[PDB]
Design a protein around this nucleic acid. Structure first.
Lengths: 122, 124, 116, 125
RNA sequence: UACUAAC
RNA sequence: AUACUAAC
RNA sequence: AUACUAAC
RNA sequence: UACUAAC
C-alpha cells in the first residue's frame, strides 16, 4: 500500500468533455473495470469530481475537496501496477478527445447500457 | 460562357446527427461564398435536406425545390477542372466534420464565434 | 444505366491506399460493394491501374468510383458503399482499420503465407 | 526556496510510432525552453526512452540515467500551481501530436522548418 | 462549438 | 506544408 | 433513434 | 495492417 499517483484530466483544455461520466460508465461499471484491468484502486477526485447533488451522507471520506484539479487517484501495492492504472485511465481520456463523430463506441455502449438499466431503452 | 455541373453527395445516412448544411453555409452564407471564391465555381446546396420545414418557396431560387436527389452540393462551372475543384473544397468541409472529436472543429468553432459577433454576443 | 462518379479525396489524403482498400484481395471487397449496392462499380482515373475492359483503359479524369445501375435508388446505394470505405479509411486509427486488417490476413491466407 | 516535483507520463504504449521526445524538445531544445517560461517551471524529459542508444553518459545531467519509470516529463517548481501549469503545458503538446492527422501537426511542421532555417537546408518551397 | 441559410 | 528536433 | 453515465 | 488490383 506504498505507491500511488495522480493522473490529471486535461479539463482546462477540454472544458466541454464529460470525462467523469466516461470514466464511470453506468453504475460505475466502467471505473470498476479499469480497476480490474490495472489491479489498482482508482478514485476520481478534485475540482469537479462531484456532481450536485446527493447528500454528503454516505459519501467517501475526503472526496469533497475541490482545490486540486480533477484527477484519478490511482493506488496499487506495486509500482508497475501504477503504470497500468495510468495507462488504462489514459485510454479513456484518449477515447474522449480523439474520437470522431459517432465513433466513441464506449460512450455509445455506456449510454445504451445506461438505458438498459433504466428501462428507458431503445 | 457555356456551363455544366456535377453533384457532391453528403454522407447523410452515415452522419444523421450532423448539420452539414450549416457547416457549408456558415454565418450569412459567408462560408459558402468563400468556397465559391476558392474554386471559381457557383455552389448550391440542393437535394432533400437542403430546405427547411417550412420554408416559403418564393424565397428560393429556381431548382431548389428539386428533391429527386438526397442532400448534395451542386457544382457549376464552365470547365471540368473548375468543377472538380468545387467538389474538392466541399469535400474538405465534409471530411473535417467527419474526422472531428467534438471540439477540434476550428471551422465550426470559428463560424459560431463570428455569428455571436454579428448578433453582438461574444462571451469570453 | 444511370451513372455517377464518386471522387476519392486523394489530394487530402496523399498516402492512403484507397484503391487497394476498395478492392481487397483478388478484388473481393469491391465485389461485395457491387452486390451490397446492386451497382456495377469500377475504379477509374489516375491511379486505377497498378504500376483494360471497355472502356477501362482511359484516365483523363482523377481517381473515382464510376457507379452504374438501372435505378437512381441503386446509384445512391453505390455512392454510400464507396463512401463508407473512404470514411472508414480516413476515420480508422492506424492498426485499427478492421477492414484493412482482415484483408491482408485473407490475402496472406490466400497466397498461403498466413502468420500466427 | 524549496522545490518539489511531479511527473507527466507520455502515452508511448498507445502511440509507439510517435517521437514525443523530439516533439517536446524542438530544435536546440527551444520548444521545451518555451514550455518552461510559460509555466514557470524547469522541465526535464526522463525515464525509459528519454536517452538515445549509445549516448555518452558523461554528457548527461544528474538524474538523467534514472530508468525505473517509463518516459515522462519531470516538472520541478516551488509551488503546486506552478507544477500544475507545468503538467498542463506538456500535456498540450501531447494532445497536439495525438489529435493531428497526417501533416496536420503544425508545431511539428514549424519545428522542422525552424530546424531547416537553422541548418541552411530550408526550402520554403 | 453562441448551432450557421447563401444563391 | 514534415527538413524528424535532443534541452538540462 | 450517443439514452449523458456517479463508483468508492 | 501479411498492404490488397477487380471489371
Amino acid at each position: 500500500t506504498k505507491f500511488q499517483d495522480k493522473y490529471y484530466i486535461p479539463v482546462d483544455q477540454y472544458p466541454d468533455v464529460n470525462f467523469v461520466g466516461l470514466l464511470l460508465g453506468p453504475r460505475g461499471r466502467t471505473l470498476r473495470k479499469l480497476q480490474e484491468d490495472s489491479n489498482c484502486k482508482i478514485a476520481i477526485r478534485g475540482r469537479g469530481s462531484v456532481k450536485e447533488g446527493k447528500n454528503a451522507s454516505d459519501l467517501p471520506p475526503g472526496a469533497m475537496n475541490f482545490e486540486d484539479p480533477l484527477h484519478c487517484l490511482i493506488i496499487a501495492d506495486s509500482e508497475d501496477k501504477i503504470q497500468k492504472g495510468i495507462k488504462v485511465c489514459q485510454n479513456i481520456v484518449i477515447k474522449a478527445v480523439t474520437s470522431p463523430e459517432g465513433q466513441n463506441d464506449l460512450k455509445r455502449g455506456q449510454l445504451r447500457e445506461l438505458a438498459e438499466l433504466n428501462g428507458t431503452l431503445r
